[PDB]
Subunit: 414 residues, 4 copies
């Protein structure tokens, strides 16, 4: 029964973010966990620092691509489990980009590029670290090292959109000293969104009062947890990757369809969450061609969906038996999100979408002036039963040559 604090309300309006995984692992192109899962010799793996040139990393291109896909923030891996830092740690560690041939603070380039495009920069930081022996040998000292690495991020790069922490699940029973860590963040970055990824086995959990967002990794839940009754509201976020891996994986051919990606983005909004779509950069920091294809396709959809994608919120309006349709609410309009439509041919050439296609909703109590598809402005016919709050629209199929996967009709009230 609490409502979101302004910065959280601002976060929910972001809607869609791009997740970016890039580290030393990227050179191998066999997934970001390669060092542990393939049981590599650490010394040999860590030699990858010597060929980390970042020769194709262009933060401007990345920010441009995020803008074009309709993303409003980017979460970049500043340090993954491998423990290599993509920024200047100022003497905290020698395992950082300043000790690689790249010799560029990549996080500085990233934040400048985000600002030029009006995107919020978010920093992913692994809390489970494979590089520093402090992790197992002196946990209290490890917490200090982690906190210092975050402190550098809080003080050297201007205002930060958010932090995305990951790895506390590796030591479920430890005292991670979150009030000190989060408190430090609140001191230097009062407006930052704090996310703690509590991992696959503990979905929806709030690990500290300072947490703003709970995560659902890889897969969508049925409902988003918004925090205990009477406590601070926390937002939710789902994250998906295009194939089975987060870092680039050259021989992972198991990509989701573009259509499924569109349905997952719409679905997140339906259940009241943001969604992160992940891409893994190449070894040298380029967006791979495959990811570019997905971004172009999703980008066509998000441009069409712009009136509702950001401000639209769940509302107690359900769809009729046997359909996957749903409704989103802004302060001026309702929007019918309609799935499973077909292309329209003509009476001679039948594509599937030709016949009258009544789609009903329960929970709309106000007389409607008009309804129209966002993609082409066609006006739909509809009937209402105001007492039972029933709306029925004839959801016409796609014009030949197009197929939006999730089609959106805007409702204009009297």
């Amino acid at each position: 029964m609490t409502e979101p604090l302004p910065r959280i309300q601002h976060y929910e309006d972001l809607g869609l973010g791009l997740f970016i995984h890039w580290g030393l692992y990227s050179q191998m192109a066999v997934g970001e966990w390669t060092e542990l899962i393939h049981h590599r010799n650490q010394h040999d793996y860590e030699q990858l620092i010597k060929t980390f040139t970042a020769a194709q990393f262009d933060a401007k291109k990345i920010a441009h691509a995020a803008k074009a896909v309709g993303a409003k923030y980017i979460v970049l891996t500043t340090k993954h489990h491998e423990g290599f830092f993509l920024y200047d740690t100022k003497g905290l560690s020698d395992f950082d980009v300043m000790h690689a041939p790249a010799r560029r603070d990549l996080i500085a380039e990233f934040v400048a590029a985000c600002r030029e495009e009006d995107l919020l920069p978010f920093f992913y930081m692994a809390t489970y670290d494979w590089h520093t022996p402090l992790y197992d040998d002196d946990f209290p000292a490890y917490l200090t090292y982690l906190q210092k690495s975050v402190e550098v991020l809080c003080r050297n790069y201007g205002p930060v959109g958010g932090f995305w922490f990951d790895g506390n699940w590796n030591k479920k029973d430890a005292d991670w000293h979150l009030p000190e860590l989060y408190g430090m963040i609140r001191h230097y970055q009062p407006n930052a969104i704090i996310v703690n990824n509590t991992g696959l086995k503990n979905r929806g959990q709030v690990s500290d009062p300072e947490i703003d967002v709970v995560t659902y990794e890889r897969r969508t839940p049925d409902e988003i947890y918004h925090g205990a009754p009477n406590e601070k509201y926390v937002a939710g976020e789902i994250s998906i990757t295009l194939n089975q891996h987060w870092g680039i994986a050259a021989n992972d051919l198991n990509y989701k369809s573009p259509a499924e990606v569109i349905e997952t983005v719409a679905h997140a909004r339906h259940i009241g969450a943001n969604i992160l779509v992940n891409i893994g950069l190449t070894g040298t920091g380029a967006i791979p061609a495959a990811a570019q294809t997905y971004m172009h396709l999703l980008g066509r959809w998000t441009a069409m969906a712009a009136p509702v994608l950001y401000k639209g919120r769940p509302v107690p309006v359900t769809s009729a038996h046997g359909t996957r349709d749903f409704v989103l609410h802004t302060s001026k309009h309702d929007f019918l999100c309609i799935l499973d439509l077909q292309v329209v041919g003509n009476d001679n050439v039948v594509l599937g979408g030709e016949g009258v296609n009544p789609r009903s909703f329960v929970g709309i109590g106000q007389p409607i002036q008009r309804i129209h598809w966002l993609d082409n402005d066609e006006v739909l016919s509809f009937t209402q039963d105001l007492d039972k709050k029933v709306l029925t629209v004839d959801a016409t199929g796609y014009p030949y040559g197009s197929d939006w996967v999730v089609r959106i009709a805007q409702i204009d009230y009297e």
Copy 2:
């Protein structure tokens, strides 16, 4: 009881072809049927000839891309329903590429490029034509025009891999004079494969003795028809497009997953058919970026599957209850094609593929020396019951960093 003629045997070894739709419709990017389905003014639509530059058509790059994806032939639209010819009709018509600014016989460039890459060139020819008034006003004269247009293709381009006719379904009861049309083809191109697409309502029918291949458009059948029992054997072919349209359609976002494309290719081989994977070129003749992504991903799979994709054939060996696995036979080996595998993590991090995974097959009666995955040469453990012809393998999951969608194990016999 008949066996395939040599040319048809050669056809079945092709396995995979690339279908290419390119015409005036391409400039509009709203599907190849746009002229009819969107009720365009014919005069105005046909003005698209004036901006047909083919400025980005490079037959060499196209043939190279076909070779890299593992295709062994290409079917190119020489004339679609719109009735515009991509070749020099030598006085038959003014509605051809020689009267467009391109001024290049595109079919000549195509055939030369195919030959350099050892690909068979196939010519798609629409028999239902929206351009010539002969079609409705004087059908007998239309048949003469169609036959002459095919005759030009038969005499001016060297040996032709095949012809892919489409549109007889528009007049199911007409006499199309197939003996004369196919007799002419047999005269000039005795070795050509003749395919007649009998359309969605008439799957797998033989419209003349000269037909070599029956088609199944868009969708896969349960069984491939090989002709009436004592008659000429005919091969089968399934055709699929990446989204919902054959020509390019910019706002059709409803793409199939790469994984489904891989499964459909494997499936086609399982049931004893070739498969055509379709791309629509841009207005100026380029392979679009999205199609390139699919070709790169499918290309990794077909390179791995090369030992079996071409020579492999269906064999009476079935898989155990509840699996989608199947077997292909070459003269030296059997190959287990195994679906629904997961990635292998480790003891600590579980991804799904870790446990022993017994997959059984019924119909293998010969003792086996060894079994190994094509992708990494790992040796699989197995047991046999020779009397009941049971084989059981432990189908290990993918090494982290990879996912082949359909994984293939080669059997080596004693």
Copy 3:
């Protein structure tokens, strides 16, 4: 093309009861036992000596048909095993007159049907395992088959129909159907002829279909004779009784299949296998009582209702049936209504739509309890949307039927 009167009458029957009873019934391991279990023929045929029919009461069978809402009964007069349940008058010694029963069972059956206003139909297997003629002299077999049918055509008065089964065993043979059906037409001009095998002869009235045929059935060519259709269901996996077949379908599935038949424009036969001595088993009685509650409720539409070009909205299994005065919405996948405290699933407003109704509606009500439903129409697009309320607590009809009353 218009159905002949007898075929129009047939389609109004709607539901029939199929009865399988033969020597196989004594073994209670399915009607194909002789062939599938590779039994010694001589030994199997000895079952004639214990065929007493001690518990066969044709009146109880006719009563069970009436209670289930069936309008005809198809009885196995001779199955593949080749034993005749009637007096063949010298054609064969392998008939009920040579068994201890010593009763013409078909005569008792026809009298019982008549008393209950039901049509008697005779199943006759054309694939026969008894007579050596079948393999050793096919032309003479056809004569024997025809004679056995002739006895049925001439000794019992007017018959409802004949249900032939087995031509599929020899798909390429000449069965001499014009002679066989011509003989039937001579003695029994009004009888329905069904062939369980596509139309194999002009005299066929009804073809059989697979119970899961999705689409409305084939009625023959535009200028040809109209042929009706029929689907069949058995309660478990076997037609004759099978004591250790526990794989019974749900009553709900049986109800759905009966409704589905009407939706695609077919009759439906529900099968029971009698015990060795001719009794209806207790399990079959349970199904009859449950289906019988449904068919009594559905009576306004079950007989006269016909398919009509009105489709249901996306993701629904709902369908419409038409009589001359009314349309009926047949609505599936409803839930029971509890309250605010006790949620059973059927509580919320439940809009179910249909496309193809162009006339203004006065009133719509459920057949089971007369509750009036609210609805809206778009007459131009022919859309109807009803609030299909869920079942009153304590009931669940599986297929619920709403009658439409027009203005």
Copy 4:
């Protein structure tokens, strides 16, 4: 992770029980919740006591039917939400069978019948009660009334197999004084099984938790260092527990068999429910299900009682599973077809390899329980793989869940 108490171990060996719903509601045949859900006038509904004759209740027939179906206990509704008691409450209430024309202690008849058949009598008791005003108007006094009603059951009927409490879910936040209620039960009936249908372990004295029918995974047996608790699932034949004449939505007999097998697989007991008629008879429809289930449980007798879940999984895409006794393993195999022949193809004809992972011991022989046919098999002992040719049913039979006994070397 501790070992079950003797009484609980004995409970798990019961395997299958019959649930029986019978009360005043039965006379209306529109479900057991009719009084509340149909918003009936309380005074008028409660008049049903005057026609409660029990004229067709025969506890002996009920116990016989339970025995024949292979059930080892019966849970009878002694008082449902309607609040009418099927036993002599000895002055606690006038709304009991002694004030109805029946004038017979039905629970006494029930316990005697169970004993003659070697079945454990269990008493269902609704804790959510619609009759007494105490329930809403004076909850502390209600708890006393409930406890007294249970006390009568604990002192007047000899040793009681168990109690099956239902209704605490109506007031999830209330203090139900379970230490006192269960403490009283422990005093008079130390060996009784206590089940609380929570709609979680609500008190240390609970022996059995109830679970959903469709629970996929092996059940929760209590926190790691604490008392082991058993599990139980329930199924009814249609949508209602009391009789409901116009509820035609019956499950298939096949689904009932699969649910019984499934309960064993997850390590639970299962209750199959029947609702008696107004006058206390088993309806004909219920009899059909019991005859069918009975055929299956008689065949499954070697494993149904003593069989327990074990870490042996089935191959990809099958629903097969394994149960373990001290002498044998049993393969429970689903989705088989009938065997015809080459000419008449019924589906079960081909070799049908079904695999399991987790068996590490060499096997001597495997055979179907229904007909003793010996199955062929191969093993890979290092990877613990077993593959059997699971032959289809002989024509004329179909067991739904077929069971193969494994005999070890």
